[PDB]
Design an enzyme around this catalytic site. Structure first.
Site, PDB file in Angstrom:
ATOM      1  N   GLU A  55     -45.091 -24.551 -48.799  1.00 10.11           N
ATOM      2  CA  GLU A  55     -45.433 -25.940 -49.221  1.00 10.11           C
ATOM      3  C   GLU A  55     -46.130 -26.699 -48.165  1.00 10.11           C
ATOM      4  O   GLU A  55     -46.991 -27.545 -48.501  1.00 10.11           O
ATOM      5  CB  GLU A  55     -44.119 -26.726 -49.617  1.00 10.11           C
ATOM      6  CG  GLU A  55     -43.356 -26.287 -50.866  1.00 10.11           C
ATOM      7  CD  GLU A  55     -44.008 -26.611 -52.170  1.00 10.11           C
ATOM      8  OE1 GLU A  55     -44.522 -27.768 -52.319  1.00 10.11           O
ATOM      9  OE2 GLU A  55     -44.071 -25.664 -52.989  1.00 10.11           O
ATOM     10  N   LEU A  86     -42.015 -23.008 -45.941  1.00 12.24           N
ATOM     11  CA  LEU A  86     -43.188 -23.013 -45.098  1.00 12.24           C
ATOM     12  C   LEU A  86     -44.502 -23.066 -45.953  1.00 12.24           C
ATOM     13  O   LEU A  86     -45.561 -23.431 -45.444  1.00 12.24           O
ATOM     14  CB  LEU A  86     -43.493 -21.833 -44.073  1.00 12.24           C
ATOM     15  CG  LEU A  86     -42.372 -21.540 -43.102  1.00 12.24           C
ATOM     16  CD1 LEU A  86     -42.662 -20.354 -42.199  1.00 12.24           C
ATOM     17  CD2 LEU A  86     -41.773 -22.765 -42.415  1.00 12.24           C
ATOM     18  N   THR A 122     -50.863 -14.372 -21.865  1.00 14.43           N
ATOM     19  CA  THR A 122     -49.868 -13.869 -22.781  1.00 14.43           C
ATOM     20  C   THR A 122     -49.998 -14.404 -24.052  1.00 14.43           C
ATOM     21  O   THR A 122     -50.207 -13.798 -25.103  1.00 14.43           O
ATOM     22  CB  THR A 122     -48.441 -14.050 -22.229  1.00 14.43           C
ATOM     23  OG1 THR A 122     -48.236 -13.540 -20.970  1.00 14.43           O
ATOM     24  CG2 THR A 122     -47.456 -13.311 -23.125  1.00 14.43           C
ATOM     25  N   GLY A 161     -45.478 -15.858 -24.547  1.00 15.91           N
ATOM     26  CA  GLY A 161     -45.961 -16.707 -23.457  1.00 15.91           C
ATOM     27  C   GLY A 161     -44.853 -17.365 -22.699  1.00 15.91           C
ATOM     28  O   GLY A 161     -43.794 -17.632 -23.274  1.00 15.91           O
TER      29      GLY A 161
HETATM   30  N1  LIG Z   1     -44.510 -27.103 -23.501  1.00 19.36           N
HETATM   31  C1  LIG Z   1     -44.404 -26.147 -22.559  1.00 19.36           C
HETATM   32  N2  LIG Z   1     -45.425 -25.901 -21.808  1.00 19.36           N
HETATM   33  C2  LIG Z   1     -45.078 -25.185 -20.708  1.00 19.36           C
HETATM   34  C3  LIG Z   1     -43.821 -24.749 -20.368  1.00 19.36           C
HETATM   35  N3  LIG Z   1     -43.768 -24.223 -19.087  1.00 19.36           N
HETATM   36  C4  LIG Z   1     -45.061 -24.166 -18.831  1.00 19.36           C
HETATM   37  N4  LIG Z   1     -45.877 -24.749 -19.761  1.00 19.36           N
HETATM   38  C5  LIG Z   1     -47.290 -24.952 -19.799  1.00 19.36           C
HETATM   39  O1  LIG Z   1     -47.955 -24.433 -20.933  1.00 19.36           O
HETATM   40  C6  LIG Z   1     -49.187 -23.769 -20.497  1.00 19.36           C
HETATM   41  C7  LIG Z   1     -48.962 -22.342 -20.142  1.00 19.36           C
HETATM   42  O2  LIG Z   1     -48.981 -21.492 -21.311  1.00 19.36           O
HETATM   43  P1  LIG Z   1     -48.341 -20.086 -21.366  1.00 19.36           P
HETATM   44  O3  LIG Z   1     -48.296 -19.730 -22.817  1.00 19.36           O
HETATM   45  O4  LIG Z   1     -47.064 -20.152 -20.607  1.00 19.36           O
HETATM   46  O5  LIG Z   1     -49.359 -19.366 -20.613  1.00 19.36           O
HETATM   47  P2  LIG Z   1     -48.808 -17.852 -20.559  1.00 19.36           P
HETATM   48  O6  LIG Z   1     -49.324 -17.084 -21.749  1.00 19.36           O
HETATM   49  O7  LIG Z   1     -47.390 -17.586 -20.023  1.00 19.36           O
HETATM   50  O8  LIG Z   1     -49.910 -17.603 -19.455  1.00 19.36           O
HETATM   51  P3  LIG Z   1     -49.791 -16.233 -18.650  1.00 19.36           P
HETATM   52  O9  LIG Z   1     -48.670 -16.332 -17.612  1.00 19.36           O
HETATM   53  O10 LIG Z   1     -51.166 -16.128 -17.992  1.00 19.36           O
HETATM   54  O11 LIG Z   1     -49.562 -15.107 -19.527  1.00 19.36           O
HETATM   55  C8  LIG Z   1     -49.493 -24.380 -19.188  1.00 19.36           C
HETATM   56  O12 LIG Z   1     -50.265 -25.581 -19.342  1.00 19.36           O
HETATM   57  C9  LIG Z   1     -48.052 -24.617 -18.531  1.00 19.36           C
HETATM   58  O13 LIG Z   1     -47.942 -25.679 -17.616  1.00 19.36           O
HETATM   59  C10 LIG Z   1     -42.750 -25.037 -21.212  1.00 19.36           C
HETATM   60  O14 LIG Z   1     -41.623 -24.663 -21.108  1.00 19.36           O
HETATM   61  N5  LIG Z   1     -43.111 -25.811 -22.316  1.00 19.36           N
END
Ligand SMILES: Nc1nc2c(ncn2[C@@H]2O[C@H](COP(=O)(O)OP(=O)(O)OP(=O)(O)O)[C@@H](O)[C@H]2O)c(=O)[nH]1
Ligand SMILES: Nc1ncnc2c1ncn2[C@@H]1O[C@H](COP(=O)(O)OP(=O)(O)OP(=O)(O)O)[C@@H](O)[C@H]1O
Ligand SMILES: Nc1nc2c(ncn2[C@@H]2O[C@H](COP(=O)(O)OP(=O)(O)O)[C@@H](O)[C@H]2O)c(=O)[nH]1
Ligand SMILES: [Mg+2]
EC number: 3.6.5.-
Lengths: 430, 431, 330
Positions: free
Chosen positions: A247, A245, A138, A10
């Site tokens: 534990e 992990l 993702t 992701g």
């Molecule tokens: N904590 C964290 N959240 C983030 C980051 N950048 C984006 N997000 C957020 O986390 C969520 C996005 O999740 P992702 O797992 O990136 O979603 P993804 O699977 O890339 O989604 P898709 O692009 O559709 O495949 C959203 O609420 C974003 O704003 C980051 O670096 N850290």
């Protein structure tokens, strides 16, 4: 011996990866190419190679190339070995059924092979840390497909998640109540123990505990990585127990469906708040029972503690820890499990945390992370099923998932177990 | 996903389309001799999304230009970026269908259609990871309308798996010299609802009032207007062209925008368009941007969403900024202006932020809304369509070019089912 | 004026893949009206238990709709239910066996057996068409040339299929030939749930016109006989590649059929017949001038319990629906 692999799925997932890997690099003494002036407990998460390049126990996966091309463009690009950086082309695009059916199966074997060739270079592999969202394309789709296939492939070997949770203020997608319930439904049976990350909590903690006015996701990942470095500190530093992990699983579960703890990390104080800078072990242990510093932003004033492990790192004495734990058990109105006695598993690693050179937190002498299983996250599930119900009622957006391989029954089945996850969270207590 | 194939159709569609290409080409740093001058490394990054790497150091747009009247291709060819387009990709007839959708869909355009198909196959099979197709056409003319819709359906029968993006321009109730435009409209909408993934509904009416009230300009001159079109059309293509935060593609856009698959008509909007050179005052920051971005006065369809609710908003921000402040400003707006969103759709506002801004500015914000108020547009076409149809006025000019009357009946029948559909989900509640 | 949709429930036996897995027999029956599954009752028009023959299904389900369609009503019979649950067996069957043949050729015969039992003053003009919805395009089954057909709206806008093979049939034997031809042109694949899995929704339409020369009155009736495909879980069928593309379009079209059924039962304000081409061809069938019987087809193996449960709730939903029934002039 006791080695662990981080699997970053992701965009969020991957960018917490970046910050975690960058932080382990500094922690270990690892220059941004690979070379390091020393040796020592790099052992678990890094592998020393012949030419002095110390290579991550990583897999990075993205369903397009873009998030991972920023890796291999920038800094640590020479640390990150090309075999461990896996791109897609046509993405899942926020749609759970594209990530489980259509597009996900197109990388799955390939992610599993580069996982297996990394795992077959693990003398004492414990298991996996998978970082992914419960909400994205993702992250949601490819991770649940990946969890089923890893439960068949490594079996006894543990799957920890670092799971991005959306919130009832901070949310991301429209179809995200489906993403969430759909992914969980799949994860429930397969996964082992999952450390929910609430993106609102991190956002909120950065504002109120870190006094940051304009944080960016770089600032947010810096707090996130500091809880993941605190958990992973047990394998990576010198200290006492809790070096594994399992534990975590063993001591945190009340029942195994209820495998989702809350993490607190302390101190979350800004480098600029240097007036009350001398914090004690008691002080940082108080902060771990404080509703502020909860990585999952639910109400502990409604929810019960079911299970607690305290992981101390830095200048911490266990006399001080005992004393802290006895007085936190007298002070706070914390409900606990009946079947068991009082529940704290304590870990002490001697070495402090690390910040990044531009990092927002203070460079504190000691720190703690509390891993705690709470019923408070049923409040958060309840908000999530009620959003599922809204959308499902009208059938809205569901043509995009059923039209990319999914059955509508799967939504019914998913929601039915999430509604039984609701009843499991009711029944522990009476 | 990677490569988009762009298709321009009709006089408008080819003029707003050339104005698009000179905008994205300046962003990607490529000149009218096809030379990459880009001073930032990031300008070349996702270049192959819109561009073809031609023989040597030349980047050529993956654009196909279609018209029946060949003087349109000459004004493109004698336009400022003329040489950037590949002259294989100039697809021209010698007549012109003449504001008659029928001579588009059945006569002249079905004679031209296959010459075009041969060049979109050629752009297509040359693409490595093909996203899908992007057509720019009119819902009111002759070339863009019937020959556009002939295109939409013909390519989609060939590629039904990839994405069908369209920029579909809507005719004005205020102006136009062409009376029959609602005829061309009703007939087009019928094909559009069946064959696009997503439809940006681009109303001339709104573009006029955006240019006349906000920017300043009095009579309608298409080169000034086409600047506001092209700036919007850059705006939404941002996430495809350049990296940043969420929603990279069109599918994760359209997946998050559309609740029920026939409701894909989106309402565009763009920020900042404040008093040029002088202001420098008034507005600057991300909440001020979010405000302008959310405003009915900055909307590019003539349907006031203050009279019909929003389902979903996709908001593309551009520049380096705070993801938290958007999360909060999208929270704020949806809490406070809750009665203009729909309660049954939870989480109505979707946010992208790209680090790269456009040129002329440092920070920008593009609104894309899937609004129930787009029904006022389908009503305007109808009430006009059925007006002329009940007296069977002008019908012979079209039925004589091939069509049955029952095709006027069917095109109406789906537009009014589309109306019941949009009227439902305006009215609807929770439970 | 208002007649319910008859929703009729058929369970098959446990098949070979099911019995050799070791799957339990989950169906309990209470009378003709109610099926009990996991103590829960699911109430219907008629339920058919496993031993019910092909003839048995014919005289109770199909029989009466023959007299109604020839009274100049429209008639729709369609089978709904997840993969292998016994739709194609039910509708087609084994056409040329006088015990194994299904509803479709049995309908055809009893039509002509009625026409044999009529006076010399009724002329009957029967034309048939046979087409499939495969990868969301309407392939003609009696003709190989037409790969997509078009939905046109009729005299009072009711939709019908334009561009089809309308064969004008003399004998029922010649209708059995157009059925045999069209069947074997219909797109069928081997999946891990069914070796003859329907990958397309197959649409036999019999349009029967009649005039009595002496009364000088003309009547028409559209008789539609749709063997649907069965919305499947990718886990079970093991579908990748083309089998999945197929599955997507089927799940997609039957979610839409569901939503149309659902909207009608709750009384939602649009009713989206306009989603799928199947829902469009079924517009008359689900709220219009037709007597529509839905055969919901079910498996009694434990493996399919969840999806079986859903198929029963589609039928409870569906039974609530009435049609806006009337006599079809010509
Ligand atoms: N904590 C964290 N959240 C983030 C980051 N950048 C984006 N997000 C957020 O986390 C969520 C996005 O999740 P992702 O797992 O990136 O979603 P993804 O699977 O890339 O989604 P898709 O692009 O559709 O495949 C959203 O609420 C974003 O704003 C980051 O670096 N850290
Ligand atoms: N009621 C039944 N009695 C006996 N055998 C049956 C019964 N129903 C089905 N079977 C058997 O199961 C087989 C497959 O049934 P059928 O093809 O009708 O399933 P289906 O529901 O159409 O599957 P799909 O959705 O894939 O098309 C048949 O060929 C028949 O031999
Ligand atoms: N925005 C804009 N609209 C225009 C322009 N030129 C004409 N229009 C209108 O937009 C639509 C263009 O249709 P088109 O297909 O170009 O007409 P045709 O080429 O003559 O068949 C019509 O409804 C015209 O009134 C233009 O350059 N820009
Ligand atoms: Mg079948």
């Amino acid at each position: 011996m006791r080695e662990c692999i981080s699997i970053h799925v992701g965009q969020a997932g991957v960018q917490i990866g970046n910050a975690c890997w960058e932080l382990y690099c500094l922690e270990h003494g690892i220059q941004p190419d690979g070379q390091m002036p020393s040796d020592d407990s790099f052992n678990t998460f890094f592998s020393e190679t012949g030419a002095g390049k110390h290579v991550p126990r990583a897999v990075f996966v993205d369903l397009e190339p873009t998030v991972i091309d920023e890796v291999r463009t920038g800094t640590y690009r020479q640390l990150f070995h090309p075999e461990q950086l896996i791109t897609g082309k046509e993405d899942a695009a926020n749609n759970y059924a594209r990530g489980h059916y259509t597009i996900g199966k197109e990388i799955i074997d390939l992610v599993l092979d580069r996982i297996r060739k990394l795992a077959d270079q693990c003398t004492g592999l414990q298991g996996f840390l998978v970082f992914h969202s419960f909400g994205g394309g993702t992250g949601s789709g490819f991770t649940s497909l990946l969890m089923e296939r890893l439960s068949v492939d490594y079996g006894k070997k543990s799957k920890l998640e670092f799971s991005i949770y959306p919130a009832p203020q901070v949310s991301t997608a429209v179809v995200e109540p489906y993403n969430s319930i759909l992914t969980t439904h799949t994860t429930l049976e397969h996964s082992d123990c999952a450390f929910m990350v609430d993106n609102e909590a991190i956002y909120d903690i950065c504002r109120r505990n870190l006094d940051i006015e304009r944080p960016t996701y770089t600032n947010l990942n810096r707090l996130i990585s500091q809880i993941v470095s605190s958990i992973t500190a047990s394998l990576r530093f010198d200290g006492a127990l809790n070096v594994d992990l399992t534990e975590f699983q063993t001591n945190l579960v009340p029942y195994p469906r209820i495998h989702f703890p809350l993490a607190t990390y302390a101190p979350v104080i800004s480098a600029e708040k240097a007036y009350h800078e001398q914090l004690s072990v008691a002080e940082i242990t108080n902060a771990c029972f404080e509703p502020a510093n909860q990585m999952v932003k639910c109400d502990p004033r409604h929810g019960k503690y079911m299970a607690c492990c305290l992981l101390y790192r830095g200048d911490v004495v266990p006399k001080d820890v005992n004393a802290a734990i006895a007085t936190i058990k007298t002070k706070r109105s914390i409900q606990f499990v009946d079947w068991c006695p009082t529940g704290f598993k304590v870990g002490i690693n001697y070495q402090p945390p690390t910040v990044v050179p531009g990092g927002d937190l203070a460079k504190v002498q000691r720190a703690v992370c509390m891993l705690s299983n709470t019923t408070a996250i049923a409040e958060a599930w309840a908000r999530l099923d009620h959003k599922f119900d809204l959308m499902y009622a009208k059938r809205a957006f569901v043509h995009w998932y059923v039209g990319e391989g999914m059955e509508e029954g799967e939504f019914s089945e998913a929601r039915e177990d999430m509604a039984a996850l609701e009843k499991d969270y009711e029944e522990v207590g009476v | 996903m990677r490569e988009i194939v762009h298709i321009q159709a009709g006089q408008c569609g080819n003029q707003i389309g050339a104005k698009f290409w000179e905008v994205i080409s300046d962003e990607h740093g490529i000149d009218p001799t096809g030379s990459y001058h880009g001073d930032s490394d990031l300008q070349l990054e996702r270049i192959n999304v819109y561009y073809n790497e031609a023989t040597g150091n030349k980047y050529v747009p993956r654009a196909i230009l279609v018209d029946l009247e060949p003087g349109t291709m000459d004004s493109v060819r004698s336009g400022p970026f003329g040489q950037i387009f590949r002259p294989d990709n100039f697809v021209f007839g010698q007549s012109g269908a003449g504001n008659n959708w029928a001579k588009g869909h059945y006569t002249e355009g079905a004679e031209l259609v296959d010459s075009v198909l041969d060049v979109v196959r050629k752009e297509s099979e040359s693409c490595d990871c093909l996203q899908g197709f992007q057509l720019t056409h009119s819902l009111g003319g002759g070339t863009g309308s019937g020959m556009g819709t002939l295109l939409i359906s013909k390519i989609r029968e060939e590629y039904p798996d990839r994405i069908m993006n369209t920029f579909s321009v809507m005719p004005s109730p205020k102006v136009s010299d062409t009376v029959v435009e609602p005829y061309n409209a009703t007939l087009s909408v019928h094909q559009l609802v069946e064959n696009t993934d997503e439809t940006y509904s681009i109303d001339n009416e709104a573009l006029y009032d955006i240019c006349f009230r906000t920017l300043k300009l009095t009579t309608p001159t298409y080169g000034d207007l086409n600047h506001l079109v092209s700036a919007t059309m850059s705006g939404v293509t941002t996430c495809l062209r350049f990296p940043g935060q969420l929603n990279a593609d069109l599918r994760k856009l359209a997946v998050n925008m559309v609740p029920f698959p026939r409701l894909h008509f989106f309402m565009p909007g763009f920020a900042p368009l404040t008093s040029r050179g002088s202001q420098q005052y008034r507005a600057l920051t991300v909440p001020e941007l979010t405000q302008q971005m959310f405003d009915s006065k900055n909307m590019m369809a003539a349907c006031d969403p203050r009279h019909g609710r929003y389902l979903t908003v996709a908001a593309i921000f551009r520049g380096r900024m705070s993801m938290k402040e958007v999360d909060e400003q999208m929270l704020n707006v949806q809490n406070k202006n809750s009665s203009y969103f729909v309660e049954w759709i939870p989480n109505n506002v979707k946010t992208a932020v790209c680090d790269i801004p456009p040129r002329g500015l440092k920070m920008s914000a593009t609104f894309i809304g899937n609004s129930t108020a787009i029904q006022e547009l389908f009503k305007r076409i109808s009430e006009q369509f059925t007006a002329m149809f009940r007296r069977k006025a002008f019908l012979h000019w079209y039925t004589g070019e091939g069509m049955d009357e029952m095709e006027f009946t069917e095109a109406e029948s789906n537009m009014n089912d589309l109306v019941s559909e949009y009227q439902q989900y305006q009215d609807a509640t929770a439970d | 004026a208002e007649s319910n949709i008859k929703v009729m429930c058929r369970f098959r036996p446990l098949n070979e893949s099911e019995v050799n897995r070791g799957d339990k027999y989950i169906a309990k029956f209470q009378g003709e009206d109610t099926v009990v599954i996991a103590s829960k009752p699911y109430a219907f028009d008629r339920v058919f238990q496993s031993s019910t023959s092909q003839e048995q299904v014919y005289n109770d389900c199909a029989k009466k709709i023959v007299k109604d369609v020839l009274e100049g009503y429209n008639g729709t019979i369609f089978a709904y239910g997840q993969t292998s649950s016994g739709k194609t067996h039910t509708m087609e069957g084994k056409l040329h066996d006088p015990e194994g043949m299904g509803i479709i050729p049995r309908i055809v015969q009893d039509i002509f057996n009625y026409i044999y039992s009529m006076d010399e003053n009724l002329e009957f003009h029967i034309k048939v068409s046979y087409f499939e919805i495969y990868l969301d395009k309407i392939r003609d089954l009696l003709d190989v040339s037409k790969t997509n057909l078009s939905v046109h709206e009729d005299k009072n806008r009711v939709p019908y299929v334009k561009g089809a093979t309308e064969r004008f049939v003399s004998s029922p034997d010649e209708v059995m030939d157009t059925i045999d031809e069209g069947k074997s042109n219909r797109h069928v694949a081997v999946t891990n749930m069914n070796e003859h899995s329907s990958r397309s929704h197959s649409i036999f339409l019999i349009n029967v016109k009649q005039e009595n020369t002496q009364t000088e009155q003309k009547l028409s009736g559209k008789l539609y006989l749709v063997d649907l495909a069965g919305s499947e879980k990718v886990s079970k069928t093991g579908a990748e590649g083309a089998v999945l593309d197929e599955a997507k379009n089927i799940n997609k079209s039957l979610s839409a059929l569901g939503n149309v059924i659902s909207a009608l039962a709750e009384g939602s304000t649009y009713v989206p017949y306009r989603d799928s081409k199947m829902t469009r061809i079924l517009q008359d069938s689900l709220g219009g001038n037709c007597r529509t019987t839905i055969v919901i087809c079910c498996s009694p193996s434990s493996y399919n319990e969840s999806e079986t449960k859903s198929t029963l709730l589609f039928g409870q939903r569906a039974k609530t629906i009435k049609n806006t029934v009337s006599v079809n002039v010509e």
